């Protein structure tokens, strides 16, 4: 999971 | 033969409520209206997506959780983290109504294309391509793009999805990863640590849908000419091999110079050329927005692109309107690229292109  | 323009004052007000892009929908519409382009299009009021329509892609468990935290505004629900709600996708009050409005708007545009009312249908407030069936992601709560494609499947046997957003269209790709009825093509920044982190050229889909997913990894600083020539070559091979009957085009403006994300270095003209190449196919085409975090620039881009669809040359000077003061200090439609290098090596670009050509040979 990445942060946008 | 006149393009459809999805709009209603209630719809724009709804889209204005997004925390990540406040008032952007109004700015986009007002600039289009200021250029009097809405008079050259068929304005269609969008309907709200029903639970069942949304359930064509999203799970009931997710939709019910989304609706639950929406009515409350509960940003502290113990289940929200696993459902993708958090920093990127906060549980804003009425967020379910917002997402249902956007989904329905794209479905409405798709229905207009099915009914033969138009050849081009436009929903600039749509294009939320990160959302998965049971998870919000990257400012996307509901994947209106997928919903639109599923609606188009009623009439069109093969659908081509083209994603020119800065980020990888992972949600749309994942939705159709196992099918050959829909081909996804995403041009995006691909670099470790950059959202969403997926979409390498080696990603081609799974099972029966193998080779029916196309990814074009791109580095920082790419400008109009290199981007278009790279986009044209890929789309040319894709069109030959896949032979689509309908096109869904995501045009996120976060690739445009001036965007705070400061990755690509595009102008709306470069994107316009990609758009013109697709329109040349003369297929039923659903136009979506997406990213874009320099609001005035995003309005500049999508207004210019609207003119491209209408085949009109817009005045260089921004006409007076509600948000005129936000267009300083030059107050012109054109956008100037930044003075930073293009990190894309020409040999790597050709290398990626040849890899894609190799993959598309399996598409028969
Ligand atoms: N993913 C992402 C990146 C940057 C952000 C800022 C600067 C503000 C915000 O509210 O959310 C962001 C999300
Ligand atoms: K993209
Ligand atoms: K696919
Ligand atoms: Zn984006």
């Amino acid at each position: 999971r990445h942060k946008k | 033969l006149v393009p459809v323009y999805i709009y209603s004052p209630e719809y724009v007000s709804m889209c204005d409520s997004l925390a990540k892009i406040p008032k952007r929908a109004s700015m986009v519409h007002s600039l289009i209206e200021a250029y009097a382009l809405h008079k050259q299009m068929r304005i269609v009021k969008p309907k709200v997506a029903s639970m069942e329509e949304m359930a064509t892609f999203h799970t009931d468990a997710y939709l019910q959780h989304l609706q639950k935290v929406s009515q409350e505004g509960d940003d502290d629900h113990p289940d929200s983290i696993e459902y993708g709600l958090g920093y990127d996708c906060p549980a804003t009050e009425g967020i379910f109504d917002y997402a249902a409005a956007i989904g329905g708007a794209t479905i409405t545009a798709a229905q207009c294309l099915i009914d033969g009312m138009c050849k081009v249908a436009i929903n600039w407030s749509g294009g939320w391509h990160h959302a998965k069936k049971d998870e919000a992601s990257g400012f996307c709560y509901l994947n209106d793009a997928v919903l639109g494609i599923l609606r188009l499947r009623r009439k069109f046997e093969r659908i081509l999805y083209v994603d020119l957003d800065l980020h990888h269209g992972d949600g749309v790709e994942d939705a159709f990863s196992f099918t050959s009825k829909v081909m996804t093509v995403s041009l995006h920044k691909f670099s470790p640590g950059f959202f969403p982190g997926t979409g390498d050229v080696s990603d081609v889909g799974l099972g029966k849908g193998r080779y029916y997913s196309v990814n074009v990894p791109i580095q920082d600083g790419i400008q109009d000419e290199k981007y278009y020539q790279n986009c044209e070559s890929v789309l040319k091979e894709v069109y030959q091999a896949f032979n689509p009957k309908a096109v869904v085009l995501q045009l996120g403006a976060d690739t445009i110079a001036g965007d705070p994300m400061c990755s690509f270095n595009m102008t709306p003209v470069g994107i316009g050329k990609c758009l013109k190449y697709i329109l040349q196919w003369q297929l039923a085409t659903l136009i979506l927005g997406g990213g874009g975090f320099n609001l005035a620039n995003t309005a500049r881009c999508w207004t210019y692109l609207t003119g491209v669809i209408l085949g009109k040359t817009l005045s260089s000077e921004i006409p007076d309107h509600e948000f005129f003061t936000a267009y300083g200090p030059d107050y012109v439609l054109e956008i100037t690229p930044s003075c930073r290098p293009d990190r894309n090596e020409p040999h790597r670009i050709q290398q990626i292109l040849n890899y894609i050509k190799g993959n598309l040979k399996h598409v028969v």
Side-chain angles (χ1 to χ4, degrees), chain A:
Chain A
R1 176 176 295 185
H2 290 50
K3 294 200 147 60
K4 185 174 168 190

Side-chain angles (χ1 to χ4, degrees), chain A residues 4, chain B residues 129-130 138-139 165-168 250 252-254 261 290-293:
Chain A
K4 185 174 168 190
Chain B
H129 58 171
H130 290 308
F139 318 153
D165 194 280
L166 176 63
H167 305 89
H168 174 219
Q250 207 269 21
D254 41 10
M261 294 198 173
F293 310 97

